[PDB]
Subunit: 344 residues, 2 copies
């Protein structure tokens, strides 16, 4: 017997929800039955009552149960995501994704256009000439032909639009900011997942563990929702349904310390210029961070196998990410991705 008064009442009492309550709430939102006030109340209360992995998993599962799927047998078993919660990072994630795909690891990303001038995943890709708004059959064909696909959230999650509007109206991060990485409709089993919210990274890791994903959930100790080069990073390594928390230092692999002012994401047009520069062989702090993050995604991919060893997996990941840039394979993959969109 579920209801808003009951569910919101329980959250304002600072109590974890009973099993299925988060799911009921998200289903109401997804079926268009929740008024904007109810959506907003739920998002704030869930946020101020620290969400648990069970609750966030319930929200993401309901969202996925409403999403358009990709066609049967079109997503490889070892596809990876590279994505962060933001709250930015999109330049790094996007470049790293292209590098990973160029290395031979299939990548399927998922995202929105940004509400600000600060680019979303989608905005930077469009600036580079990639057609981001394609239907399931064409994303599958992209993945097969180019090695990478992008699922536009507005297209694959049409029932989420009311929630999206509420989030923009309240304008501050909530539990819904966690769901991007957890609601990729291609359902990749691996990924490098950035989380800006240090206290919630462990929660996201828990959700991925329940799904038997091989993921590195990463939080830069300088706040970045990516593996940073300015200092150490905290990694929640997810494999075989378990989570190990680690401190990671890229200097151990010979990466120079950089400054934060050098790495943050900006608008889509500037992100686009930075992509072209890095993929064209420009050296410096941005390249290093892209390489490190690409390697991280390759390591997560390697973890799909029970016989993967941490330090050797990192060394291979770094070699592969560097080579994908240095040979021009990453630059050529982007060009082939642009051409894909222009040829139907």
């Amino acid at each position: 017997v579920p209801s808003w008064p009951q569910i919101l009442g329980r959250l304002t009492d600072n109590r974890d929800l009973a099993r299925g309550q988060a799911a009921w709430a998200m289903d109401q939102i997804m079926t268009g039955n929740a008024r904007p006030a109810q959506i907003a109340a739920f998002a704030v209360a869930m946020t101020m009552k620290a969400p648990t992995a069970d609750e966030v998993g319930e929200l993401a599962g309901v969202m996925l149960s409403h999403a358009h799927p990709l066609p049967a047998d079109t997503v490889p078993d070892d596809a990876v995501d590279v994505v962060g919660t933001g709250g930015n990072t999109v330049n790094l994630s996007t470049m790293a994704a292209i590098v990973v795909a160029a290395a031979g690891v299939p990548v399927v990303k998922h995202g929105n256009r940004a509400a600000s001038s600060l680019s979303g995943g989608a905005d930077t890709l469009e600036a580079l000439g990639v057609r981001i708004d394609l239907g399931p059959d064409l994303v599958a064909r992209s993945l097969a032909e180019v090695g990478i696909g992008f699922c536009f959230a507005a297209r694959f999650h049409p029932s989420y639009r009311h929630a999206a509007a509420v989030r923009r109206e309240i304008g501050v991060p909530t539990v819904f900011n966690l769901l991007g990485p957890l609601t990729n409709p291609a359902r990749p089993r691996a990924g490098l997942i950035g989380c800006a919210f240090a206290d919630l990274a462990e929660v996201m890791a828990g959700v991925f563990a329940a799904r038997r994903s091989s993921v590195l959930v990463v939080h830069g100790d300088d706040g970045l929702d990516e593996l940073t080069t300015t200092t150490t990073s905290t990694i929640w390594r997810v494999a075989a349904g378990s989570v190990d928390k680690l401190t990671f230092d890229p200097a151990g692999f010979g990466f120079a310390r950089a400054q934060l002012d050098q790495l943050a994401g900006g608008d889509a047009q500037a992100n686009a210029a930075a992509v072209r520069a890095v993929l064209g062989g420009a050296r410096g702090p941005v390249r290093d961070a892209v390489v490190l993050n690409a390697a991280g995604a390759i390591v997560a991919h390697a973890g799909l196998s029970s016989r993967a060893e941490w330090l050797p997996a990192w060394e291979e990941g770094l070699r592969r990410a560097s080579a994908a840039i240095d040979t021009g394979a990453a630059e050529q993959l982007l060009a082939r991705w642009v051409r894909f969109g222009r040829q139907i």
Copy 2:
């Protein structure tokens, strides 16, 4: 540069607002400039952070600054309110309403404030209508009622038309929020004294702080059974507000010879049932309902007495109980309700 992201961000970080921020928010809400999502976010966030008296006082201040006032010099300086937050989840008779009539009949001017029920079968305003009292009079006529009858009723929707945006969000989300505190703090006649019920034990102290800041003489009451009234089934917690300060007491009616009642004996019904119960009490029916009415009327009289620095607690209660009982026993309360009904029918 105040904004919703700023204010909501601060509340969701579990931080108290800066001075002026709650006021800014409430003012956006009252002028129709707040989206429903923003209203609901604000109400919920503030509730979970734990509102301060400064914050709640700002909200109520903004409401009062937008309300229709009564004409100048028409509200006596010692007028009292008898009103509560509601939301106690018990279907009780309209104890504040019955106590208000008794208090007015004892000679203390009363200006009540209210709406038609949120989640009981019958609110104070619904029960008054069923008795034949006109609830929806304007400022001039409320002031005239106060002068001619000794009591007036300010219909919350009539006096706070701009609250409609907040009210609708409250109804949509259902859960109690800080907004549930505002009714008793926003009587448009601005009485300086009152017996104020609070269903939410954790927020009563906050309400008491708001009244202390305005230099009101108020008893903020929470029955330890959960009632937003002085109860007869058990003890009540009272936050006594006098001289700009608050002190917390526990009140036991056994100390004044009241027998313990059971909660189901104070149960009410629809507006006709509760109207019938008002008629029975004013007519001299003895029993648990009368006891609770007499106790609550006495509490409002004690609050009124506290407008003087000289008032002492136990003498005040004894006087209040004598006055409340006499007002019923002499027929003064029954006659005042009749005179109130007649006043309204004569336009």
